[PDB]
Amino acid sequence: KVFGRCELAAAMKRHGLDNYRGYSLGNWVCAAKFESNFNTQATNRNTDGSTDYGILQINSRWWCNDGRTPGSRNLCNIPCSALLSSDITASVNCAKKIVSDGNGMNAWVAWRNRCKGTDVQAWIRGCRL
């Protein structure tokens, strides 16, 4: 599913991500924009053989199981395929664990490089939320 911008912001709010660990909804929408362009089916293979899955491009080295990442963990306790669903529940639940892990949203390199410090409220501007 490719979400619309306001559509995703609404779904993220519905699942409790808005201001989670102090990161406003616009942070989360911005991160999703640059990680997946709002496409739940986005996948990206990394040089280390791990893969990133879903709207927030959650990586298989720590967070989900894909059966093909040697030495990895599955801290969210889910198949990485669950991260590709049209229903963002699994992605949101796993993102909450990832953002709680110590470096906040810096866990998402793209958030650091493209969202951090910017006018992230632009990402929710105009939306009925």
Ligand SMILES: [Cl-]
């Ligand atoms: Cl495995």
Ligand SMILES: [Cl-]
């Ligand atoms: Cl393996």
Ligand code: NA
């Ligand atoms: Na957009």
Ligand code: NA
């Ligand atoms: Na915001």
Ligand code: NA
């Ligand atoms: Na894994």
Ligand code: NA
């Ligand atoms: Na959803």
Ligand code: NA
């Ligand atoms: Na980047």
Ligand SMILES: [Ti+4]
């Ligand atoms: Ti594996």
